[PDB]
């Protein structure tokens, strides 16, 4: 028998890379022009949100076999 939950981790690294890319894109967008000092902060908030969401997705997938 082979691992059925190993697959849960398949897209994990690329998903995290996508989210981090997104955050770095937003930080870049903030820096192109003068903006409110909190502009960069709001992209960070969206990143943290996506990571918690991806981790919860992973937990859900694991339970789905176990």
């Amino acid at each position, epitope marked *: 028998k082979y691992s059925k939950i190993k697959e849960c981790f398949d897209s994990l690294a690329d998903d995290v890379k996508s989210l981090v890319e997104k955050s770095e894109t937003s930080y870049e967008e903030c820096s*192109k*022009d*003068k903006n409110n000092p909190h502009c960069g902060s709001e992209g960070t908030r969206e990143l943290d949100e996506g990571l918690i969401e991806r981790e919860q997705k992973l937990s859900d997938c694991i339970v789905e076999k176990r």
Partner: antibody
Amino acid sequence: QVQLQQPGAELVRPGASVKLSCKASGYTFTSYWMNWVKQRPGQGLEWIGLIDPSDSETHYNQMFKDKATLTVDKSSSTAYMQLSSLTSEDSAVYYCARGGTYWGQGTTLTVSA
Amino acid sequence: DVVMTQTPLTLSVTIGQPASIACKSSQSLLDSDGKTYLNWLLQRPGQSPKRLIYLVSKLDSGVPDRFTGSGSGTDFTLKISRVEAEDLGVYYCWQGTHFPYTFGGGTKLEIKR
């Protein structure tokens, strides 16, 4: 898919006022300062002012101090610019631009009877 | 207000040839925050402006590396390594360091064929 949606045209009569809109989507509205730019037929670009959608703080080119008023509606992700006491000089294309990268298609304002 | 002065006013270039446009400001665009908000825009006729360069030398989204921005302080240059047919239109410098934001008068690029 950052998009800034402006109506193609507004026609209003001399003396009256107009309220131009710019509806944003594809990003977090409150994060970025929004510019407004005027361009007369065959001429260059003129900066009118900008607004911070998060707190409605504004910065104006003083040339437009008695002409333009900038506001936002966060419930609809819309930036507004109101132009008062219209004259033929106000006939122009008006752009909203989120920073310098993202531009609306412009509203052609015609001041005529 | 910061006066932005572009030279030349018009440029006629053979396809495949290089092109250079200069922008001079009446004051330094170096902000107390250490950044220099000099932008280059291109506007093809009947279209919204698009941004080619932000922060003096940084290529914006979609912009090919045929475009190079350089300079500092009060003197800036945009170079096209080799002009293509699609590059035609009006180029504007635009400073977003000092209020009010101000634009150069534009440099028209015509193609020779």
